[PDB]
């Protein structure tokens, strides 16, 4: 349950492909969508 | 909640460690006691 998409709108992994837009102040830029795991997670007893 | 209850609606969003509701207030107080990021919370209180 510690999987997140670089674009928060796309909930599932199959959706997280292509390019998405960032709206930061006084600019509009486009970056890749990436399906990533959080840096600290709970996947096995060692990671926990 | 009396001092900072209604003034964490900043232009960048409401912080998770807000004093809006009671369950949110308890966690913010608990976090300060453990000492993690108590200065960042204080910065929000001063800015508010």
């Amino acid at each position: 349950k510690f999987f997140h998409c670089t674009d928060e709108s796309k909930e599932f992994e199959k959706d997280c492909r292509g390019k998405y837009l960032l709206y930061e102040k006084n600019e509009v830029k486009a970056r890749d969508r990436e399906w990533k795991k959080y840096e600290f997670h709970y996947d096995n007893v060692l990671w926990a | 909640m009396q001092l900072f209850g209604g003034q964490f609606n900043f232009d960048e969003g409401t912080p998770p460690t807000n004093f809006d509701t009671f369950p949110a207030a308890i966690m913010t107080v608990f976090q300060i006691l453990t000492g993690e990021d108590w200065n960042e919370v204080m910065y929000d209180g001063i800015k508010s």
Partner: peptide, 26 residues
């Protein structure tokens, strides 16, 4: 989940990787 290099506030904890940096950017 704000992107890297976007203005950030540490209390938000919304930064995608790591945390909000000293200079105020992810």
């Amino acid at each position: 989940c704000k992107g890297k290099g976007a203005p950030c506030r540490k209390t938000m904890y919304d930064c995608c990787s790591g945390s909000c940096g000293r200079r105020g950017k992810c």
